[PDB]
Amino acid sequence: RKERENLIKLKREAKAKGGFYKEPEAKVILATRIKGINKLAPKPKMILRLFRLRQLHNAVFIKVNKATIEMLKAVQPFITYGYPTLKTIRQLIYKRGYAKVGKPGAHSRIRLQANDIVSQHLGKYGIHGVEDLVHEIYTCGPYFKQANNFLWPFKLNSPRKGFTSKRHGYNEPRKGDWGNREEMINELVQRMI
Amino acid sequence: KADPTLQQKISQYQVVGRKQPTEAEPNPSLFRMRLFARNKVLAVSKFWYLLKKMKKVKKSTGEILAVNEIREKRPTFVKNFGVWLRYDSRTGTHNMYKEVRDISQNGAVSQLYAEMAGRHRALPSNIQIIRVAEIKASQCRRAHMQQLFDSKLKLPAIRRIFPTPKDKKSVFCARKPTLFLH
Amino acid sequence: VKRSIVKKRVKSFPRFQSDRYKRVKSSWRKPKGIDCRVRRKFKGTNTMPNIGYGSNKKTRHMLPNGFFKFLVSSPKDIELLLMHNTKFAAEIAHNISSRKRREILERADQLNVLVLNRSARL
Amino acid sequence: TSFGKRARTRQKFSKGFRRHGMPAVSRLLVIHKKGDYVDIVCDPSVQKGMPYSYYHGRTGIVFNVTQRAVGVEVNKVVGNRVIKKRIHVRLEHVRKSRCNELFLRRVKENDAAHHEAHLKGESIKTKRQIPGPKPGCFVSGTMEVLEPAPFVES
Amino acid sequence: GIDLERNGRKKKGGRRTVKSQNPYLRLLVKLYQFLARRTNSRFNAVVLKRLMNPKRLKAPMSLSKLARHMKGKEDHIAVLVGSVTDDIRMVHAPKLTVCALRFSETARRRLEKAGGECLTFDQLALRRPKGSKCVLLRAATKSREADKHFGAAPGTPGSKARPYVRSTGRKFEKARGRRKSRGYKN
Amino acid sequence: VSKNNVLPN
Amino acid sequence: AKSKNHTNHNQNKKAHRNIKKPQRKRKMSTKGMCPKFLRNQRACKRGMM
Amino acid sequence: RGQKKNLLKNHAVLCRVNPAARNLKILARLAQTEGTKQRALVLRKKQANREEHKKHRQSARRFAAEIRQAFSDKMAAELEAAARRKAEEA
RNA sequence: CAAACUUUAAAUGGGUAAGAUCCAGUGGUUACUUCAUUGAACUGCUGGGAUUAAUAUGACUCCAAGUGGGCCAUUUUUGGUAAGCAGAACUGGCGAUGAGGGAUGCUCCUAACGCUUGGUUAAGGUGCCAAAAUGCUCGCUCAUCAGAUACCAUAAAAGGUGUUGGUUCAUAUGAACCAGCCCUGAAAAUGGAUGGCGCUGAAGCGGGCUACCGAUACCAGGCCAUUGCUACUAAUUAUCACUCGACCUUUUGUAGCAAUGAGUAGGAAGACGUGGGGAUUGUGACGAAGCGUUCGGCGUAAGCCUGCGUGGAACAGUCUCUAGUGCAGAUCUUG
RNA sequence: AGGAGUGUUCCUGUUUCCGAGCUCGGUUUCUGUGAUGCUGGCUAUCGGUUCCAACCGACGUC
Secondary structure, X not given: OHHHHHHHHHHHHHHHHOOEEEXXXXXXXXXXXXXXXXXXXXXXXXXXXXXXXXXXXXXXEEEOOHHHHHHHHHHHHHXXXXXXXXXXXHHHHHHOOXXXXXXXXXXXXXXXXXXXXXXXXXXXXXXXXXXXXXHHHHOOOOOHHHHHHHEEOEEOOOOXXXXXXXXXXOOOOOOOOEEEOOOOHHXXXXXXX | OOOOOOOOOOEEEEEEEOOOOOOOOOOOOOOOEEEEEOOHHHHHHHHHHHHHHHOOOOOOOOOEEEEEEOXXXXXXXXXXXXXXXXXXXXXXXXXXXXXXXXXXXXXXXXHHHHHHHHHHOOOOOOOEEEEEEEEOOOOOOOHHHHOOOOOOXXXXXXXXXXXXXXXXXXXXXXXXXXXXXX | OOOOOOOOOOOOOOOOOOOOOOOOXXXXXXXXXXXXXXXXOOOOOOOOOOHHHOOOOXXXXXXXXXXXXXXXXXXXXXXXXXXXXXXXXXXEOOOOOHHXXXXXXXXXXXXXXXXXXOOOOO | OOOOOOOOOOOOOOOOOOOOOOOOXXXXXXXXXXXXEEEEOXXXXXXXXXXXXXXXXXXXXXXXXXXXXXXXXXXXXXOXXXXXXXXXXXXXXXXXXXXXXXXXXXXXXXXXXHHHHOOOOOOOOOOOOOXXXXXXXXXOOOOOOOOOOOOOOO | OOOOOOOOOOOOOOOOXXXXXXXXXXXXXXXXXXXXXXXXXXXXXHHHHHHXXXXXXXXXXXXXXXXXHOOOOOOOEEEEEEEEEOOOOOOOOOOOEEEEEEEOHHHHHHHHXXXXXXXXXXXXXXXXXXXXXXXXXXXXXXXXXHHHOOOOOOOOOOOOOOOOOOOOOOOOOOOOEOOOOOOOEO | OOXXXXXXX | OOOOOOOOOOHHHXXXXXXXXXXXXXXXXXXXXXXXXXXXXXXXXXXXX | OOOOOOOOOOOOOOOOOOOOHHHHHHHHHXXXXXXXXXXXXXXXXXXXXXXXXXXXXXXXXXXXXXXXXXXXXXXXXHHHHHHHHHHHHO
């Protein structure tokens, strides 16, 4: 609440001067996969495995570097990504939140019913409860990589009102789908739950 | 409750980016542009496309500061618009000047993409509306505008085909309908 | 026992073109033909058996009655089904005499064990 | 087609423009210790010991130093597998590589950084940071109002 | 509908059970898979796997090699999932305390006379359940007629593989390929 | 004759 | 009755199905080094025994 | 495993995961309703804003003018450039 | 102006490096090297350092099958007037592959398949055939051969005072030029094809906006199998609140959890069945084998069990051994 | 969701209100992990084997 209120007071104060407040660029994005398995060039096929996007209607939280942007250029037309909010992150981890549990070889994919699963695996890093994941993803903490790779990638159902046209970008005035929506992926993913 | 069906979902947006600071060239010159678009995102897309034609700038080399939504001042009453635009025919490019009448600028540009597609087959991608100024009645130069101007204007309702609300509709009726109405 | 009973199929899987030719008998054989529709799996044709259609572990070989049948030859071999009487129903065999049925059937009722055949030879 | 030691070399083995004549003497005074990276660029000016065309522009590890040559191990895909191939080559056709030199600088600063803590309890976790997202500030200057352009033929 | 490699479901290459119908070897494994599961010590986990091996990995260690692995460490029990043969070249057999699957009747005579205990694996469990102060050994796997033949294939430059040849001496695979005077050396 | 066997005799 | 002369089709897909990289090893192999040099590495190793 | 039980909905199963969720439910519920303990804090913070809304509403209209002036000047300035090219060439 | 010219010179691709197989300090070995304990490579010891960019993630040896006629598509491209022609480059398909759409189609689109209950979409559609709009909203078009949905099932140069807009000059009228739909140009042989009927305040052409319908795809659940992980002996595991009751494991197994499931050529695993041999448990003149059957049952399936009728003399279960061991096809053979 | 049982002693929930500095401890009734509750028709239906109809589908080898 306080950083939301403090964000407003900054860009009111700077507006009273003369200038404009350039906002902080978003540290996490939320990819979703849109086109399926068949007919994929072998470089785009690799990148989607590196994001753990192995089938249709799969979400994943993914970090923003210069590196991770220049991966997403190559994949764009198989993907609809963008910037989450605290509502949609809470809704994902509560409703669709599963967690991967075991050695290299087999991990099991377990439903987040209690904090003791989260506690034993991430109790090194803080992160004892389910609510401390939601902080570490939304803020992007120092232990994002650990907390993200704990979560088995999200398995969303098909959006209640449908897509427009998965050929075309979300930009273009045919109102298509692929590419990145800065915020409006939040309106999509709330239907895919 | 307000009917979604009549209008297109255009909204006007101001945009302001500024290129990007460098050690050679600190504090660049700032930009500004009014645009029409679906959304706060798709305005920024159209900003970088148009700014690429003017000046040596890109989305990677640029930085955007503010996306202000603009609306009408007073949307209650009717006003004349002189829209300037360009589009791309299968031969080449042509500038136009159309004149449209509605309550809002958003209502005019919705009405124009309908009109422009319908006549000239101009696709959404090609059209770029340059500026949408408000015009006095004694200013519009088009003849289809001029007939409307003048107080005491009257228009008789002729041939009254009513779109019946669904459920009102029945496949059979007795009487045969009445279209002159009176 | 008698638990719920769910079957997936009730139809058999008849052999492709058993209807057409009388030389081809109805006993299932996978079509291995290169151009065959049944193996290639067009719609509107004979279904193939998969393991998909396998019935429940709890209720495999389970009769309509509730029991599993365990078929039986002599008077001595029913004694085996004494403690498993609730679980097993005994089917008196193909071959057996009128005499030795009425020794089996009478010995079964001493043991409170159900016999499937009844009024078997009279 | 036709196969020769130098087939299709033309542009590839061309000396350059205004770059004709023999190697300079300072490039011939470079030392190459074994266990060191070198890019094999072949200059057509000297025809003695020039490597085969495929190896041209390939970085690899010096394994031997003959008196007037340098044994370089490079690596080469042959369908299913890489295989490490050992090619001798004359001194003029070898350059010193510069591919490792960020890492070589890096360790001297990084090992000295971990060293100097001692009793403050190190745990520095020394690491490059990839330049991702910028934080926010207010910005203000002179403005211009632009609009989109009407078409002109010319 | 998953982009997965083999949609694995990926199998493990090594043997997953006992192949013998030898009942004593089966009961040996039942002991050492109770003892592996429950005890936690990695000694018993390894002995379990090596018990399930095929015959060519249960290769015979000689009494004279078993001396020299056990040379500094005289007190410790010398375990070998395998057979133990007598070395005839060894004159005075060292005493040791060996455990193994099978001793040849010469090597059982030679140890037992020399003052030297000769255990089975079920006896080793009673003394040493954890494998505390033991020495695992095994005989060399790649040391047999058959494994001379493997590798790079004999007519390729710098292989040391044997060819499959019916008979030894000249007149058999000693000409074209083997001499420079006959076409080429390789 | 295929594979690595003895040349048959 | 020709027939196709040559093709590279499905060859990258075949190779990548399995492109093995040789395992790195400590201590470089000496095959193809100078015989003069490798004489003095034997004389070196003898002198510390 | 019988069933995997729901978060958000339910209540006993919820308040195991995030034990603060019971009290934030009663916070938002009672701050709507005219139970006056928490409703006083809402109506105080609303009127504290609502006066500060009337404070700056002079400067709000000055931003609407700062836009419409600037593009109406460019609208005017662009049309005079079109007038000069007709005159100077002919 | 240049495939066999070039000062200059992109994108997309290619190489190497980014530490525990490392870095520094110091002593020794040496026929090498140096003018020289100068170097060089290799080694002993002593410090410094645990994953030193991002993201994801467990990584040899042997034996052998089939195959070595390929074809297609987007972009690149050579011969040719061109070809559903011939020959290449990169990736993806078809072949080996169904399902939903394109009326109909091996190669286009969506999307890859264990049996299924419910929910949601994809491509594509909503006058009727046909599941869903004679929905809403704004333009254009009248065809005495309208038009109607990518690959795709052809159309051009050149015209039009037919109509609807635009650009720019000249006095209300008068030119010039531009592009939308429509018309002309527009000829083939059985009777015929926006798929058909038909359709003009469209059910046409170019746009808007809601909702709906629509797969074997996605989502949650039940059952079957596979792979992987767990747990199972001072043997009363006994149901994870605790007694009685009922199912329940033969670790060459069971119970639990999760993920997965297309397939020709080909490989491997576990089962079903037939004629004989060994061992063992049996049936039978009060009726064995075989045969017939809407009396029926079990198994995913190969198959097994069984009532009734005929029949009239031998047959079967289990564990093993063995083979002249399973038929729809061969212009198969005999009848 | 269903063969019995006893019952909340522990446990989470909601609640009576007592004290310590919104947070923790003690205490009373109530409900869960320990929930199937009430009721009707038929004793022939339900179900099964056969043949037939209807809507939709559905044209061995190189």
